[PDB]
Amino acid sequence: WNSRYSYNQLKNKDSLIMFLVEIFRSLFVSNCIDKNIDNVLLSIEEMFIDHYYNPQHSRLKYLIDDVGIFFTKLPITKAFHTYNKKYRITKRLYAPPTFNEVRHILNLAQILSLEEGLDLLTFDANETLYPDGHDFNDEVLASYISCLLKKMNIAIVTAASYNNDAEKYQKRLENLLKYFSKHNIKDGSYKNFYVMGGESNYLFKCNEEATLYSVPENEWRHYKKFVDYDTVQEILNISEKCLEKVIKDFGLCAQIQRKEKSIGLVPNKNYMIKYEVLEEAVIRIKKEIIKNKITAPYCAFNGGQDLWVDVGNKAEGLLILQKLLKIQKKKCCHIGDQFLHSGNDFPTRFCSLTLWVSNPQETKACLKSIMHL
Amino acid sequence: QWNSRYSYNQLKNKDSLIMFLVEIFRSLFVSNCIDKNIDNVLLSIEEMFIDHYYNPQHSRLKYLIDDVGIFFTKLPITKAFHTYNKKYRITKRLYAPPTFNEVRHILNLAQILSLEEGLDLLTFDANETLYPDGHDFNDEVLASYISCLLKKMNIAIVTAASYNNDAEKYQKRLENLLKYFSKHNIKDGSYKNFYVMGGESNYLFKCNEEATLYSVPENEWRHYKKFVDYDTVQEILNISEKCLEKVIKDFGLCAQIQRKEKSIGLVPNKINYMIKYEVLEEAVIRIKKEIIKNKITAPYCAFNGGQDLWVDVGNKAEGLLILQKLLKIQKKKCCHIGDQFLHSGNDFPTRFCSLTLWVSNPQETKACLKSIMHL
Amino acid sequence: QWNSRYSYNQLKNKDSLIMFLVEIFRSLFVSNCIDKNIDNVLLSIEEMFIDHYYNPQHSRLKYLIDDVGIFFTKLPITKAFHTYNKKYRITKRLYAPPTFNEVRHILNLAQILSLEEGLDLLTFDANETLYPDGHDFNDEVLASYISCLLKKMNIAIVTAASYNNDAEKYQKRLENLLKYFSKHNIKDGSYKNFYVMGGESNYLFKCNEEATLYSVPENEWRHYKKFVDYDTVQEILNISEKCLEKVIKDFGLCAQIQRKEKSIGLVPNKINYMIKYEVLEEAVIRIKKEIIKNKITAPYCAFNGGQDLWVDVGNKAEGLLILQKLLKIQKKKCCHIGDQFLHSGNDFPTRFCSLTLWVSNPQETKACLKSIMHL
Amino acid sequence: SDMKKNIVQWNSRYSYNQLKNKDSLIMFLVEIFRSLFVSNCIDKNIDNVLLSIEEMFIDHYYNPQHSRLKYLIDDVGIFFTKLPITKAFHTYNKKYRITKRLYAPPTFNEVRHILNLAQILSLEEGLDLLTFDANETLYPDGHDFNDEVLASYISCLLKKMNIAIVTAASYNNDAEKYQKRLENLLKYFSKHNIKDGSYKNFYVMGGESNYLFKCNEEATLYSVPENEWRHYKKFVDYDTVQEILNISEKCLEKVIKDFGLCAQIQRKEKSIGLVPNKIPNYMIKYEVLEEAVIRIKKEIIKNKITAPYCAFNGGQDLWVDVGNKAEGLLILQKLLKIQKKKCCHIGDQFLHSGNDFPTRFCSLTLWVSNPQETKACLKSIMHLN
Ligand SMILES: O=c1[nH]cnc2c1ncn2[C@@H]1O[C@H](COP(=O)(O)O)[C@@H](O)[C@H]1O
Ligand SMILES: O=c1[nH]cnc2c1ncn2[C@@H]1O[C@H](COP(=O)(O)O)[C@@H](O)[C@H]1O
Ligand SMILES: O=c1[nH]cnc2c1ncn2[C@@H]1O[C@H](COP(=O)(O)O)[C@@H](O)[C@H]1O
Ligand SMILES: O=c1[nH]cnc2c1ncn2[C@@H]1O[C@H](COP(=O)(O)O)[C@@H](O)[C@H]1O
Ligand SMILES: [Mg+2]
Ligand SMILES: [Mg+2]
Ligand SMILES: [Mg+2]
Ligand SMILES: [Mg+2]
């Protein structure tokens, strides 16, 4: 699930997205991008199916060595037409398609592949629902989530750990539960709504009063991979020792914060820390946990201007709900922003469909496209 | 010297000089020797930058990097890396290599230390470097750094914004700046050393002793400008507007065409609806390639900046060229500060006539000025 | 006309137009659609090759590739692809994309199929495209093609080989070709359409009724040669000679310098001790950068042969211009076959005044002539 | 890892990106030397950079799985010795003076030479077994041994260490047919080596790990009893050999129909080959041969065959052998009780889809282009003591 951290894996943006960018770029250069390129697009699709069936020996694997596993047949041809007709990006003559645009097309393809249905949908609460640290105050998208909960399960998986205090999480979602009591409380859908804490440590359901409450540990401790309490603390001690050198190596205005099953450094009044120092820290931390031969599920991610290390994994959270709610991976989806190799949403590619979002407005465009299907 | 070199390599690849240094530091990073005395590497890079100042078209640097700008000064790249590294210690990194923005600051500091001969003119890009885009200047810290520099040399505000000759609408954009000038820059003769250039090189302004900007007559400095008649200025507009109408049609865009004397813009409206960044690039080249189709050699500039497109019949290099001819200061002692230093930006042509400092936000301009004053 | 410069990036990728097609085909190969009906991609490429022929200054091909030369003819790249594909089926490859050299064969074929209007002059690099380096002509198959082609057009031998001005030396190179001309090309007047240009563009020779070369009177063709005086010729030789004498020292070369009137070169000692190809490519750029440093503007050429280096006062581009002005031949009716079309090769400047076929061995030239005869 | 795992990853975990760059480690040094040349500092004293490169090489000798070198280059081999890349650069540059170049950077082939020289200098602890790729490194492709100078070096080394010849040539068990390829070498061995006991130290391996021969006191080559060394080799069922041979054979037929080729299919026991038709020899495209090797490999895994094989490109030939040169080296290391640190191999096919590539998994390797380069190696090897 990790330990494949390579130099080449860091400097290059994305294996799959750039793969389509370079093909579109050459198509743009040959001046044939506006003509019917269905022959090219379907051959791209012909591979995506061959990678769905034989993901270990597909030709897509020979071209791109580090491809994730495809859980559905991706209609990349329909995804291009639908995105093209709306934005007319092919109408350009001097500006090639952008990595960001191909990520948009790739996300649309994963939505159309859900023609068989969708049983579970999860969100990365931070920066995909509301900016870093801010509270939920966008009333528009809350109507989308309420409608989808009527036809599927909705979960919130966010690396923010507030221990087991269920009351603290409501302040982050008070406006959301307010919309649930007005519509979902009459329906029978409110019980299908869950919230995950840490990355996979604190689970809360939803009561009849649109109130978040803790879940008995005996209801899902067997679904979670049991980890020695001594090993958990060791991971934090390895991290706490590593961050001190990081703050000592580069003189910076921050300090370390300790919790139960999670630690991270946060800049104090705040004085920003370079994006590369946080990148350096994740690889420093990972190489040490490798050196100590720790196999427990963990994660270290570079999100915004703070670094954290949790003894949970955002993929284990999806794995718990699937084993708990009797849901397959092919009918599971997750929306997040940290989809780089130093992000905590990347592990979700190993067990669920994924949608890469840069700001909460794109989640509105994501769910809006999902609904009209 | 028309900037007509619209090249696919200019759009596809970033700054030539910066990425040249990044790859070198990357090999120094990968070889594990970046934390040792790498002075032998840095000295040869300086040896190259020195010879480029002498033979810019036959240097080994121009053979390596074709399409280099021009070095108006001898650049101390060794001392700049030495002093940048001591503050941030990027070199103590083991798994993340030196990045693009880091070398951007190193080259900025390299240009700053090159002013051992002295500095006689500063220019500031108004929007995005002195205040956020579409805002009024609201900063007391920045104005305090500028005030001390105003006594040492002449300072100018060269912007791309255009209000037609109305000096009252310009002081509104930088109210708190004149307020600080009213307090500390009146007794000194520095009040007669501050300039403001609206449009792009079209509307020149100055400061009165009562600290409210006044517009300078046209007949005093219009002769320094390139003679562009009113008929050709409007065809550059007309051809542009015809191209923007195609852009509103070719792409579903909720955008308005703002027409003024000597300028055309592309602005959306809120129900603002954000235009795609890549269409802006596509439209800039459409306008430039269409103007050359009519053999128009008039100094113009079409640029995508922030969230809107504007085409001015002035040039932001002309503005710096005007002030160099007015105050009789060679290009060696003139420096510019802006955020639009890509091929699509409007601060780029100043590389042809003045030293340049690449900045992304107002906080870096304050960090720029603080280092420029400990000289 | 002037000989253009070079960037270190331009020295890497041998030909930009060829490389421009390779990366397109590679994305076609990568996308799994290479062996399907890809004519939309092919015809669109032809659309830019046509638009660059009609408007070479402002074309999208000029926009994407900055150093694109001049298309003297409409290039049928779509038919050339199908033709080369049907023979070798390079599109049936699944795990290896089409190569640089394969596109070279296609680009040559597209240039050949563009000659539907006709040819008036065909020229041959003598060394390495008619016979191995430094050998006498020995091939009857190839001789029949040149013989049959000498009936329908003019045929000239343009080689940088310099034997001053005695046709006996040049005949030893082309003995077996001239004896074949006696048996078939004398009953008619075809031998009066054969030429041999000595020393790139310094010596001219014609054929004679006895199947023997003679030197054309200097007055008959000297006015087209851009005059270069004894002083300027000797400055180029001396500036070069000084460079080679350092090139020998720095790398401890086992080689010698050979001086002639209007030419100088670096030859290995007899034993034939191999001399590094990298040092040869360096000696070109060392000399070229020195000649331009001394403001020399005369037509010269420093080229990197297989096992030696040579500098010649004159070049094959001017040599073709001499023949085109001699026989009143238009540019669009000219063609040249050579082996070194790298930027440091004496056949590269022909791109500026003729159509070109890039070959690497005498076997590849027969494939060109057989394809040319079958039209 | 274990050799069975390496062969599994070699014939099943290639990549288009990895097959583009010939060697990941040579390209590693080329990029660094490129920037050093681009930075203009490459002609000054650069022990600054080189020593740091050596430092990472040493850390990789001790910690191959979690080293900084393995971070930068994902697919590094395993270093059996400490490479003095600083001395190899000093030694190679003082001869050729490639740092005096101002407008031409060092090439892949030069860094390949420096890396060979570093591998040679790493043999300070001594050498006990030296093996040679026969075709194109001892004599041109398809020829017989007709070089006197080479025999003088090999005979001199034969007195000091064990010598072997691992080749892809596959004459079933006719030692007279192998003698014809090297008769001038055994002719020199008879004149200068029968006096020593060194002729017993000389071995020849046919097939690729299938046939073995030793030198007689009469300088003649004789077959080695299979009861003496069959056990060291991983056994392959007769049904699985012909399965490999047949699944390959079907592909060469498709390659001839796809691309119109004047070529034939030679069938032997434990070996198939795609050989070209005679001229009245025709030439087969290099990219087609490279294409078919991937075609062979891609289909063998589709049939879930895991036996050790080797599909390889021989310049003008395409062959598949049940067996590989890494297996043949293991058998000689198990036969003469020789550790990998004191064994070396010289060959020309060190690319992926190459004959001598699996040698990197169990020996020191020298990447040589022709017998003239083979001499420069053995000349530098003799200069050690
Ligand atoms: O251990 C935790 N305790 C409190 N906050 C955390 C913890 N881990 C991550 N965070 C922060 O909360 C957010 C969680 O990331 P997410 O996966 O995008 O929701 C980020 O802004 C983190 O900086
Ligand atoms: O002609 C003009 N009239 C009014 N606004 C303009 C004009 N030209 C540019 N602008 C806007 O004002 C900004 C000034 O750019 P800057 O001062 O160069 O950073 C531009 O980015 C546009 O948003
Ligand atoms: O100046 C000259 N005099 C005599 N031989 C020359 C001269 N210049 C070049 N050569 C040799 O003749 C060859 C002509 O090559 P070509 O131009 O490709 O025909 C060169 O590669 C040199 O070996
Ligand atoms: O199985 C085989 N039997 C006979 N000849 C072979 C066989 N395999 C390859 N060959 C040819 O013989 C050469 C010997 O290979 P090498 O000795 O490893 O260089 C190859 O390059 C092929 O041309
Ligand atoms: Mg997030
Ligand atoms: Mg700006
Ligand atoms: Mg030649
Ligand atoms: Mg071999």
Author numbering:
A (entry chain A): 47 to 315, 327 to 430
B (entry chain B), C (entry chain D): 46 to 316, 327 to 430
D (entry chain C): 38 to 317, 327 to 431
Could you pull the original sentences from the published paper?
Maintaining the optimal nucleotide balance required for normal cell proliferation is controlled by 5′-nucleotidases amongst other processes. These enzymes catalyze the dephosphorylation of ribo- and deoxyribonucleoside monophosphates to their corresponding nucleosides, and also exhibit, in certain cases phosphotransferase activity.
The crystal structures confirm that the IMP-Mg2+ substrate is mainly coordinated by conserved residues from the four HAD motifs, and by W365, which is situated on β-strand I. The base moiety of the nucleotide is stabilized by a π-stacking interaction with W365 and by three hydrogen bonds with A205 (Motif II), S207 and D367. Mg2+ is coordinated by the phosphate moiety, side chains of D170 (Motif I), D394 and Q395 (Motif IV), and the main chain carbonyl of D/N172. Concurrently, side chains of D178 and D394 flip into the catalytic pocket to coordinate the substrate while the breakage of the salt bridge between E173 and H398 induces a complete reorganization of the segment between D394 and F407 engendering α-helix D402-F407. Concomitantly, the four subunits bend even more than in the PfISN1-ATP conformation to adopt the most closed form observed. In this latter conformation, we do not observe the NTRDs as seen in PfISN1-Apo and PfISN1-ATP structures. Despite adding ATP prior to crystallization, ATP molecules are not observed in PfISN1D172N-IMP structure. As concerns the IMP-binding stoichiometry, we observed that in the PfISN1D172N-IMP structure, each subunit binds one IMP-Mg2+, a feature also observed in the PfISN1D172N-ΔN30-IMP structure.
